């Protein structure tokens, strides 16, 4: 039932144990698929799919490869300088969440969020870096230094507003054959632990589905039983998913209940399991 969205999410994990020990690791997601991997040990961004470069030429990919190499070295050098200036103690952990989403015909949406020790400190907005609603005093000082760099502001603007929506459309076109993949789930009913004395737990398992958009509801014929506990969509190594949907019901009201599964691979033929 849910709409399949395809934003490009470029994630960066930078750890600083001491002034001497550091590593920068990253990856790229196109929706729920991982297209790229980036280790501190390698000098290039690793392609995971045969269609990961998109419609970009070898020359265009090399320019990005160059920007990421210069960025990592520069980023890892700037944090050490900032920690010395703003008197910030090690260990340090910085996270970057950059990317965009393409809306064919209409204007594209972009983002660049930076977190410090799991909390939002700043983000790129329009043509400059901007602090979070509530941000420590040392963030405003780091922003004063960061906003003085005309070149980085222009590189980030050009990467987000220009390069990124182009790259997304290229991936959507080069990987389309793999993006239309459908993997039918296996479903079954079970009785989970007793939640109360005169009550029982109904469990509906949906296993091995791809893509991730799914709909699972406990039903009384056609009446949607609000009180369905969907839980987390858990991952499988083969890129398929797992989901459990439970329902707390007092003994007797379990009769006439069913579980309705809606998924794209089912081609309209919903899985309906009666308890």
């Amino acid at each position, epitope marked *: 039932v849910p709409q399949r969205l395809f934003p490009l999410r470029c994630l960066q994990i930078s750890s600083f144990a001491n002034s001497s020990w550091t590593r920068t690791d990253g990856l790229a997601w196109l929706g729920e698929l991982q297209t790229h991997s980036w280790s501190n040990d390698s000098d290039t961004v690793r392609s995971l799919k045969p269609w990961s470069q998109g419609t970009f030429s070898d020359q265009q990919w090399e320019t990005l490869q160059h920007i990421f190499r*210069v960025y990592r*070295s520069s980023f890892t*050098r700037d944090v050490k300088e900032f920690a010395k200036m703003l008197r910030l103690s090690y260990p340090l952990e910085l996270q970057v969440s950059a990317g965009c989403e393409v809306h064919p015909g209409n204007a594209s949406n972009n983002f660049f969020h930076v977190a410090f020790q799991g909390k939002d400190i700043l983000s790129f907005q329009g043509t400059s870096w901007e602090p979070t609603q509530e941000a420590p005093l040392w963030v405003n000082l780091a922003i004063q230094v960061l906003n003085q760099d005309k070149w980085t502001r*222009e590189t980030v603007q050009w*990467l987000l507003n220009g390069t990124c929506p182009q790259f997304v459309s290229g991936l959507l076109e080069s990987g389309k054959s793999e993006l239309k993949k459908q993997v039918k789930p296996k479903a079954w009913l079970s009785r989970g632990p007793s939640p109360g004395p005169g009550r029982l737990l109904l469990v509906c398992h949906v296993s091995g589905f791809y893509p991730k958009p799914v709909w699972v509801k406990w039903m009384r014929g056609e009446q949607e039983q609000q009180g369905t506990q969907p839980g987390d969509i858990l991952p499988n190594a083969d890129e398929t998913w797992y989901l459990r949907a439970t329902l707390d019901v007092v003994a007797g009201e379990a009769a006439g209940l069913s579980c309705r599964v809606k998924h794209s691979s089912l081609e309209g033929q919903d899985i309906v399991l009666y308890w």
Partner: T-cell receptor
Amino acid sequence: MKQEVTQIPAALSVPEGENLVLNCSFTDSAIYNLQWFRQDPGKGLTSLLLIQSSQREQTSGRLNASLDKSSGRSTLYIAASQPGDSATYLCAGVNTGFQKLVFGTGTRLLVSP
Amino acid sequence: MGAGVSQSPRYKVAKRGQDVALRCDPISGHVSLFWYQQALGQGPEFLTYFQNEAQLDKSGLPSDRFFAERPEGSVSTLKIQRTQQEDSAVYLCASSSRDLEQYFGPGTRLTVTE
């Protein structure tokens, strides 16, 4: 796409006092800055003018240099040319996520007295 | 200029096959260093780029014979091993701050002869 900087004309012999125009074209419009240089035989670059991506025009003495990213063009105007201006004039650009200058081949300018 | 980039040797005549070393003393405090190659009646062509001590762009380097260094983030040397006639050129060195407005040295005129 690899940046290609082109300068028209390759050579120009002009009489003293004349207002001359030097052309520069580039295929990649994602420019960080554009730098015009002067070079005397046989080595050493003298910085003349620098136009920033936001900037449209820059002046200094008898020199005026315009930048048009959308048409991929830069012009260097020399007012009331003197024999002392006689040199090779080079146009170069730095692209948005780059550091290196990509240069044209140059205009060999000769201003006869 | 008085307080600019220095290069040495200003002129070098080398025998074919010999090793040559070219030095560049950038403007004090300039984080960025660039090497360029300029052939006779041609525009300068980028060789390599240094940001502090790191050689972050080596795309212009023609072959294995060309190797550049800047170990202390100041002085840079460019070494050409087993020099050939085609290596004859002006080697220009430049330095800049973060604005990337490049200040060029007087260059090294290298002539490689039999």
